[PDB]
């Protein structure tokens, strides 16, 4: 009988091991033990992104945001989901929000967020070109 913390740590190991469905299931067990922890949901969302299930990832991002409205990663992963689902305007807004929150929180992710924004804006422009 592992604790929620142990399950989260096991999921993290499985993630390092690139065992994404297994990791996601572990985070699910963590959520069962304590469903009030936003990080279990954002961790599982990243697994779902790796598994090409952005809709499942999006629902987890929403659950995380209900628990922690200031979550940088929940906004960033939500942006990634929307990008995959071709909701470009919303994706860019979420990535820009992740950028703003990371700044407000004085967090440092190097160039990860601006790089993701650039990818999102390009993808948006390419979608416009693909239609004319």
């Amino acid at each position: 009988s592992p604790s929620a913390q142990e399950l989260k740590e096991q999921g993290n190991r499985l993630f390092v091991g690139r065992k994404y469905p297994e990791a996601a299931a572990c985070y699910g067990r963590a959520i069962t033990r304590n469903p009030l922890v936003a990080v279990y949901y954002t961790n599982r969302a990243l697994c779902y992104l790796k598994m090409q299930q952005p809709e499942q990832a999006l629902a987890d991002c929403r659950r995380a945001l209900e628990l922690d409205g200031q979550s940088v990663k929940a906004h960033f992963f939500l942006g990634q989901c929307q990008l995959e689902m071709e909701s470009y305007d919303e994706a860019i807004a979420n990535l820009q929000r992740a950028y703003s929150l990371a700044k407000e929180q004085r967090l440092n992710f190097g160039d990860d967020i601006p790089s993701a924004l650039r990818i999102a804006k390009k993808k948006r422009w390419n979608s416009i070109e693909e239609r004319r």
């Binding site: 990243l46 940088v72 990663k73 440092n108 967020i113």
Partner: peptide, 7 residues
């Protein structure tokens, strides 16, 4: 820290 990673 990298952003696309688990916590």
């Amino acid at each position: 820290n990298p952003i696309s990673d688990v916590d």
